[model samples]
Target: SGPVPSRARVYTDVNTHRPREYWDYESHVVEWGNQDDYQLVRKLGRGKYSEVFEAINITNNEKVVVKILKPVKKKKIKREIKILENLRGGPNIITLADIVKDPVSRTPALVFEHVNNTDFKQLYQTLTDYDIRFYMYEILKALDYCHSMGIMHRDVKPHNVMIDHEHRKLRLIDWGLAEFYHPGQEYNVRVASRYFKGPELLVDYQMYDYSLDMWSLGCMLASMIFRKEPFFHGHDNYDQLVRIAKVLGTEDLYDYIDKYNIELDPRFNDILGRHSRKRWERFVHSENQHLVSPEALDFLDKLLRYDHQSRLTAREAMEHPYFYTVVKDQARMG
Candidate 1:
């Protein structure tokens, strides 16, 4: 009749065992450092939640990111800061350096380790097949680490993944929507953006866990390999699930809801049509054939499944055949 509560398959106790002082950000007093230590080099593009900027750390004269919030996000911002501190030093995770507030406005700002890569569309198209594989594996490492700590990085679109190709570095940023995983916890399905929204979300099922991130990560891969910008490409949120259903088949969606006892929103009654499960090869056109491989196709299926519990964990994804080059080449490249 409705969504059944769900828990993460692994790392369920990560938050339970930790002390309240660590997870309770509301109670943790804001410790601010001097804003004078940094100077804005230039304004970066405005994100949905925050204004990004390239800044200079005057102390060492090194480049850094000074992320300024755009809203009355006083409560949300604390969660972001606390999350970054909790997951700091993990591989491919963006590092939080210091917290400062502009004296005039008295608004807080988060200082982060700067990662290069803007113009993602231009760069993503230019990346070689091996480059995508290597980076996806790196992203998997970040995903695995976050899940290990019982955190779900609710947003996993291309924008949040900062890649420095010149230096071959990758960092996952934007923890604003990330939440701690607790058993049977019901999270707002409103977390990720439309195109990247997992089926669990669009169906109004709120008990989704880390698998939501895995699905979003799958969308990233689907777009990259298929050469489609935001693979689902749904004009609106409702259309978002329709687009996914069109590709994955409507029957699979029904199966998913049945498994989780999820009830589809009435809005879907008119828009959703019967769709057969499309084969992965159908997307491999001449232009993208080079990007699609047997191993990659297999990996994609494993991630894009309607059943969240069946989706491969990030740790398991790292060991997939698609990453064989990533594991071996990384050693040689280093």
Candidate 2:
């Protein structure tokens, strides 16, 4: 038994109208750049698929980021490159300056425009309500742009969002996990981080689409407003669903699974139990009350739903009342 195919509640066929070239990864041809053109300054960070380094372009002496990919399938690498190329001119998407390969090891590296990002742990704490709305709206722009172009950012979380607060700039980085949507196709459920994984991923629902990003964005917003490092603190993958059920309610999760005809994995049989939906107000306290609002809670509720299709599209989210101040501020600035 398996989950019934469920299309995104909105934007279900967006990719159908786009030229196949925009979403075709198999036909992509890599245009390699010179490796010697950039020099590594220091390590910036490391992830499962890449090691990031702060680097300088030898030609212009401008700072940049170099992401050296770890050993992975060539197809996966091409998928990332093609997605980046497709979204190159889109707003708020990270700029891909070049692609290089080491001479001896033949290790491929991606060069990108530099972002002056303060660690979110430090930055989020200092953000005012206005700042939260401003930045989240900025992120919505990127998500909407990409989804419009038929891409689903399989991974969406604070780590991949680079914020240059001084410049009031936000960039959605790390396209390595992004993929083009194909209606009715079963995609890998293994994508996205644990805390940020959508119900579709957790339940083996493979026909998920761009709305997955919306779910992750919801989790990010919840953490920011509630001052919880991760609003759903799952100890492991199985526990991740348990964590979500605790807040979203296990009964709703079952209804979601039943509606989609999803076969509950054997492992989840024992762990999955009845749970009532937790109220947003229960999370409100003096420390983070300033960031909490009826609008914020309502937005979060729409996002963190058990049913992926029920999540708000990025464009729809931009019109929500939570961003009224941000819209006003931007208009005033202009």
Candidate 3:
């Protein structure tokens, strides 16, 4: 018999309360803005599915981001546009100002609200403890909003989170892999990047839900506090779980798989050796002691759980002690 499905622990009925058209994009009409109104300033970066650029809007004399999509299926493009449309005006979710298509080539481009940002590799190196708390809280705001809306941001990596440090603002960008969550729906595990992929994906559990993003958040937080890039440094997909097991322990992995009725790919047998759980203190040293704190460690422990069901929800994560200063600051401002 097939395994029974599992649902998200929170915000489970958001889409149910909304209209059906709200979730359907295939039959919906897409209005395209004129591509000529924007001129490219410079290439920001090239992605597998799009070429991003910093561009200027001719009419308003304002800077904007133009993401010219590479050749892909129509449904995929609509999926992204639909997710962006659904998540508009959400906290820290990037704004989609316009959607355009080249009349000749029929190439689509997404024009976005501008953000002055720096790459995380360089930016993360200089982030102080207070700044890390502030930025991570901002990321949580976006995650909670998206999850509350019944959308799982399948990809939630440091690269996907854009920060304008100058203004201390963050925008969760790239809705390409984001999808609306339907209870009991079996989603493809081929979503989030390797470093940020949750155990549910690694274990071939297709019924995974929103908690996947929380694991990615934990990974992002781990790297920031521990000063390790791609903190779960796996050589490949199969080895990714091994990397996590090494830190979280092989015993918990067994318990997790058994509870979910999952079987590891036989390949893991040879490569994965028994490992004891390492203390969070093991990651701390003189180099990063200044960056580490008991509150930060407590939050990380809540997030990096072997069982996805045991992981903290985004809203719960925001309330963690690590973000006490951020929460107090917000209340004081209002």
Candidate 4:
């Protein structure tokens, strides 16, 4: 009764897992307590959706990675939590230890078991054939699991893979871009990062499947071998498809565009109309030659095929001749 309306307390549910509470407007608040529950050790990374931090769970004296989701629309938050819940446990997937609410700041945070080593992007910067073969095999295994479970990881890149040399294992993280699929449903029409975007998506085909993920895997493989992104930077979607066609040679983009009733941006004709095979020739003979084992190279070629219908699926890719000689023995070790 004594305080004015401006001085009243307010509370929000930024993190959905915890019970709601109120904050006194008069004082500043810290998210977690200073009284030995958890301690922030260092920052792991920052992304559009979250800021990753390494922390210690004081009660059990264990280390954990804390993912503080960036302030985003409620729908995105719900989608992320759902994705994490669905990805729970498997050898290749990261484990989520806990989900908590920041008491004072009222933000949502995800606590995960900390991975011991570096990611594939860093590993590729100092290229080695052995490392590439080992890591790519692990990726294929995890991807197979995801596809079988009816989940599609639209984003597949070196940066999302965590590698632990001591254990000789790898973990896949970042499911923010994941999508849940239902059998016999029309393939997801909207998906991908520019270069990794599948030809089906590029041409607006609606009935695609897990093959979209395979395309990204191909790009990741190419990056590991070449030590750089295969497609040149494009200013927009049309530019991206043009870059794709330049490397592919005579893509029938019009057939798909007309069939799908999709409009082509003017920039597309400029690049594809005067297309050359120079991009593809250089892609095959670049300095990346021999950066991956012969078996791995074959896997990449099949995964990167231009025709969506002809592209290898995750299951087929796993059984490819390349995996037998290079990765079969390692699969037994687990």
C-alpha TM-score for every candidate:
0.96, 0.97, 0.97, 0.78
Candidate 4 has a TM-score of 0.78
Tell me model 4's lDDT, rounded to 2 decimals: 0.66
- Which regions of candidate 3 fall more than 4 Å away from where they truly are? none
**Model 2, clash count?**
0
Per-residue lDDT tens digits for candidate 3, residues 1-334, read 4554688899988898899877877866899888889989999988777899999999989999999999888888898999899999999999999999877787899999988887555688679999999999999999999999889999999888888888888899989988889888889999899999998998898888899999999999999999999899999889999999999999999888878788678998887799999999999989888889999999999999978889999989988899989899989989
Q: CA shift at 167, candidate 4, in angstroms? A: 2.4
lDDT of 1: 0.86
Report lDDT (CA) for all predictions: 0.86, 0.89, 0.90, 0.66
Model 4 C-alpha lDDT per residue in residues 86-147, reported as the tens digit of each score: 56796598887777777777787778898997877776656567666667778878888776
lDDT of 1 by residue, 153-256 (tens): 99998888888888888899889999888887788888888888888888877777888899988998888998988789888889988888889999978888
Candidate 4 collision pairs: none
lDDT of 2 by residue, 38-148 (tens): 889999899999999999999999999999999989999999999898899798999999999988788999999888976455687668988999999999999999988
